[PDB]
Design a binder for this molecule. Structure first.
Ligand SMILES: [Mg+2]
Ligand SMILES: [Mg+2]
Ligand SMILES: [Mg+2]
Ligand SMILES: [Mg+2]
Ligand SMILES: [Mg+2]
Ligand SMILES: [Mg+2]
Ligand SMILES: [Mg+2]
Ligand SMILES: [Mg+2]
Ligand SMILES: [Mg+2]
Ligand SMILES: [Mg+2]
Ligand SMILES: [Mg+2]
Ligand SMILES: [Mg+2]
Ligand SMILES: [Mg+2]
Ligand SMILES: [Mg+2]
Ligand SMILES: [Mg+2]
Ligand SMILES: [Mg+2]
Ligand SMILES: [Mg+2]
Ligand SMILES: [Mg+2]
Ligand SMILES: [Mg+2]
Ligand SMILES: [Mg+2]
Ligand SMILES: [Mg+2]
Ligand SMILES: [Mg+2]
Ligand SMILES: [Mg+2]
Ligand SMILES: [Mg+2]
Ligand SMILES: [Mg+2]
Ligand SMILES: [Mg+2]
Ligand SMILES: [Mg+2]
Ligand SMILES: [Zn+2]
Lengths: 213, 135, 25, 101
RNA sequence: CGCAAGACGGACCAGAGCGAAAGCAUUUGCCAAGAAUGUUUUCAUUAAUCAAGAACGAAAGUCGGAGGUUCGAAGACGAUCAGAUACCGUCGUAGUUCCGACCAUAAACGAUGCCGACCGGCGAUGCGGCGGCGUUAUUCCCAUGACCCGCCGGGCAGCUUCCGGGAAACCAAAGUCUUUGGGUUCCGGGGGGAGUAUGGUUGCAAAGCUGAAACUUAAAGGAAUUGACGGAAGAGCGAUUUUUGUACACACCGCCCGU
């Protein structure tokens, strides 16, 4: 009868200043009829963007969730909301004749953002190894997991969210963990695979504007 | 009617393809997945319960949804392929590949493909019993 | 007859006897 | 008359093994006895590869792969012909079939 | 995009490990227990198997409380069918989950009791110890982790052999048996009647343990061979010398079960 798309309007969504590319696409919303405000429906949306669409030279198997925080006249302003890996990357990392070690921590940044970080690593076969399997004993696994947890804790609570995302973009935490665990048992494919937002501080417009410039 | 975008740039959407063994869904949403552009199911094309999952119905639904979203102003689509998941099979139905190929035929640009089948860490008991479905 | 069902039939017959052959009787 | 020395399963030095569910019929079958198959394939088929490589917005964009673990009971494995009966002498040979050309 | 409840810990996960057996898989902490290895420590026969008597013992089931997501006996329907009271599909009650009391049964299987001695090779694998060129990490140094080459001791297994066994299938034990004796516990005596009746005993119940006879019958049964069928793909005692299964051999037009 009456076209629902005649009352729709298009908005442009921007990424925070941490990333090179800022315009991450467009979105749609119904105009305000006085009952429902377009801004209210516009806020709270989550966008999963591949890192290769945010930074030119970075990998594409790392995705970032960005949540719209404020609307500035046809410009949705997003903020960091999460990070994850693609399904096929994780499926290809897990293989049958090796050990997998996983860890998770709950760390609060200096500016109030509470995060839950997950880390995964795999034991590596030696260059001249003749034995088919590469298994780490339980105490070695526990030591590796504790080394993961302490490194992930010391790289978040000291910094703030802006510096945390900067470390996440090349995933320097995984490289630090991989280097630190060489003495216990060699590890390859060490990554921080998921990051969850648990608690946010009270919303501040000035903080958002400093985050976007 | 749509975004004001230069000819060079592509307007992007996300296509959720649900390929079951009984039906096929091609759904188009914005990048946030909260706004629906067009949803066409394989059961809308064929008037039979056998052919809802057939490759032909998937091809028809893909063309219909491609035309509808081309009307509004979406030129490229990201692909999220989904199976039924859960306790049941993780293998996509026979309409996924045909729907994707038909969507490519209609002139749509293709973004990144991603498998989004729900995978439990462990789940509730599956339907069927100890001895399974004996047909 | 399958031995399982033969055993079940014997048990049911014994239960029926026990109901009929009451200890009070 | 024992047909196999290992009783058709891989249980040694343990009592109980948790059961899994057949992908085909949802039957309960012990994990060591079940027939396992790891399938790594392409999301898009052969013709779809050429049809998609031209419509993509990226250059040399690699198509994702599908990884699936499949479990079968004996009846479904035999009926689906992923497993066949062998001779009395050929049963002992447990080398995987020469799929590598 | 959030919220709530309950149940389960995928992939890694293996002819890998632990436990007396049932059984045991998210992280961290606490508590007690244990095998193996190392030992120029201590006691000095304290040991093996076991009537009586005890602890534990899958699932299902029973009685009280708490929760009830999924699945789901019984049940109500829809299909299929000559007929279905079944297989298939929609719901769905006990139950499936936790706590406290019962129950003591499984193809509870390696269908193989435990302790000790002897009797062929080979390559791996898990734990502990010992020795040794060489690559890697702890920025240097030893030393300790990850690899590599070996040796010893327990452990789960594998391949091979005219060691010898056995009706054979097969077994390094199922060997060291008419050339018959290392110690010891349980237990069988043609097929049915029958694990039935009765007595005793245990239990709330369901049932558990012990356990006959009258009568009836010339075979029942094991391993292997050649055929026939299928809605499946010089060597052996000897018969005998496309794959596979068989309870068929008057060979599926077979055989056979219960009202
Ligand atoms: Mg259908
Ligand atoms: Mg339908
Ligand atoms: Mg069948
Ligand atoms: Mg058992
Ligand atoms: Mg098998
Ligand atoms: Mg043991
Ligand atoms: Mg896990
Ligand atoms: Mg006794
Ligand atoms: Mg029980
Ligand atoms: Mg119970
Ligand atoms: Mg109760
Ligand atoms: Mg039913
Ligand atoms: Mg149901
Ligand atoms: Mg018994
Ligand atoms: Mg067994
Ligand atoms: Mg027995
Ligand atoms: Mg050894
Ligand atoms: Mg060990
Ligand atoms: Mg060693
Ligand atoms: Mg004798
Ligand atoms: Mg007798
Ligand atoms: Mg007699
Ligand atoms: Mg001759
Ligand atoms: Mg001769
Ligand atoms: Mg058979
Ligand atoms: Mg047989
Ligand atoms: Mg024969
Ligand atoms: Zn099956």
């Amino acid at each position: 009868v009456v076209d629902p798309f005649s009352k729709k309007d298009w908005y442009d969504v921007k990424a925070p200043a941490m990333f090179n590319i800022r315009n991450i696409g467009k979105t749609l919303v119904t105009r305000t009829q006085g009952t429902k405000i377009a801004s209210d429906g516009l806020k709270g949306r989550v966008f999963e963007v591949s890192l290769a669409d945010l930074q030119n030279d970075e990998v594409a198997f790392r995705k970032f969730k960005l949540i719209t925080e404020d609307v500035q006249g046809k410009n949705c302003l997003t903020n960091f909301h999460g990070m994850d890996l693609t399904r096929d990357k994780m499926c290809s990392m897990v293989k049958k004749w090796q050990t997998m070690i996983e860890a998770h921590v709950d760390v609060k940044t200096t500016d109030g953002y509470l995060l839950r970080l997950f880390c995964v690593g795999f034991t590596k076969k030696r260059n001249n190894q003749i034995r088919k399997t590469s298994y780490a004993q339980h105490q070695q696994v526990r030591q590796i997991r504790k080394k993961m947890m302490e490194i992930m804790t010391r790289e978040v609570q000291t910094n703030d969210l802006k510096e945390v995302v900067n470390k996440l973009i090349p995933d320097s935490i995984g490289k630090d963990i991989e280097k630190a665990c060489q003495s216990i048992y060699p590890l390859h494919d060490v990554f921080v695979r998921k990051v969850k937002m648990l608690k946010k501080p009270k919303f501040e417009l000035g903080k958002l504007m400093e985050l976007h410039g | 009617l749509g975004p004001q975008v230069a000819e060079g740039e592509n307007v992007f959407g996300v296509c959720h393809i649900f390929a079951s063994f009984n039906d096929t869904f091609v759904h188009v949403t914005d990048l946030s997945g909260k706004e629906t552009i067009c949803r066409v199911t394989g059961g809308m094309k064929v008037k039979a319960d056998r052919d809802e999952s057939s490759p032909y119905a998937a091809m028809l639904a893909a063309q219909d949804v491609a035309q509808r979203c081309k009307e509004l102003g979406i030129t490229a689509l990201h692909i999220k392929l989904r199976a039924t998941g859960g306790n049941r099979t993780k293998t996509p139905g026979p309409g996924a590949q045909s729907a994707l190929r038909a969507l490519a035929r209609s002139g749509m640009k293709i973004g990144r493909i991603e498998d989004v089948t729900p995978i439990p860490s462990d789940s509730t008991r599956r339907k069927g019993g100890r001895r399974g479905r004996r047909l | 007859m399958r031995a399982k069902w033969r055993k079940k039939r014997m048990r049911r017959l014994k239960r029926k006897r026990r109901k009929m052959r009451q200890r009070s009787k | 008359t024992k047909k196999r020395r290992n009783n058709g399963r891989a249980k040694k030095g343990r009592g109980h093994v948790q059961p899994i569910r057949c992908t085909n019929c949802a039957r309960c079958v012990p994990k060591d006895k079940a027939i396992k198959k790891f399938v790594i394939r392409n999301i898009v088929e052969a013709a779809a590869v050429r049809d998609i490589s031209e419509a993509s917005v990226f250059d040399a964009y690699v198509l994702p792969k599908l990884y699936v673990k499949l479990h079968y009971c004996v009846s479904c494995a035999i009926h689906s012909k992923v497993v066949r009966n062998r001779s009395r002498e050929a049963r002992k040979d447990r080398t995987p079939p020469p799929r590598f050309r």
